[PDB]
Write a protein that binds this ligand. Structure first.
Ligand SMILES: [Cl-]
Ligand SMILES: [Cl-]
Ligand SMILES: [Cl-]
Ligand SMILES: [Cl-]
Ligand SMILES: [Cl-]
Ligand SMILES: [Cl-]
Ligand SMILES: [Cl-]
Ligand code: NA
Length: 129
């Protein structure tokens, strides 16, 4: 599913990400924009042989199981495929564990490089929330 900007903001809010670990909704919408362009079915293979899954490009090295990432963990306890669902619950539940891990939203490299420090509230401007 390719979410609209405001549609994803609302879903993220409903799923408890708004100010989760102090990160405002615009931060999460911005990270989803640049990670996946709002497409839940986004996948991208990394050089280390792990793969990034879903709206927030959650990686199989630590977070989910895809069966093809040697030495990897599955700390979200989910198949990586659950991260591609039109329903974002699995992705949000996993992102909450990731943003809790110590480095906050820096764990999403596109967030650090493209969202961090910017006017992230722009990402929710206009939206009925
Ligand atoms: Cl957009
Ligand atoms: Cl915001
Ligand atoms: Cl594996
Ligand atoms: Cl494969
Ligand atoms: Cl594990
Ligand atoms: Cl699995
Ligand atoms: Cl933090
Ligand atoms: Na894994």
């Amino acid at each position: 599913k390719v979410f609209g900007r405001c549609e994803l903001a609302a879903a993220m809010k409903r799923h408890g990400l708004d100010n989760y670990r102090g990160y405002s909704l615009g931060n999460w919408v911005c990270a989803a924009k640049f990670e996946s362009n709002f497409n839940t079915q986004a996948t991208n293979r990394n050089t280390d042989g792990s793969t990034d899954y879903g709206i927030l490009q959650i990686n199989s090295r630590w977070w989910c199981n895809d069966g093809r990432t040697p030495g990897s963990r599955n700390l979200c306890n989910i198949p990586c495929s659950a991260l591609l669902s039109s329903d974002i619950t699995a992705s949000v539940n996993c992102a909450k564990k990731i943003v809790s891990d110590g480095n906050g939203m820096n764990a999403w490299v596109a967030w650090r490089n493209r969202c961090k420090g910017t006017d992230v509230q722009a990402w929710i401007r206009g939206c009925r929330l």
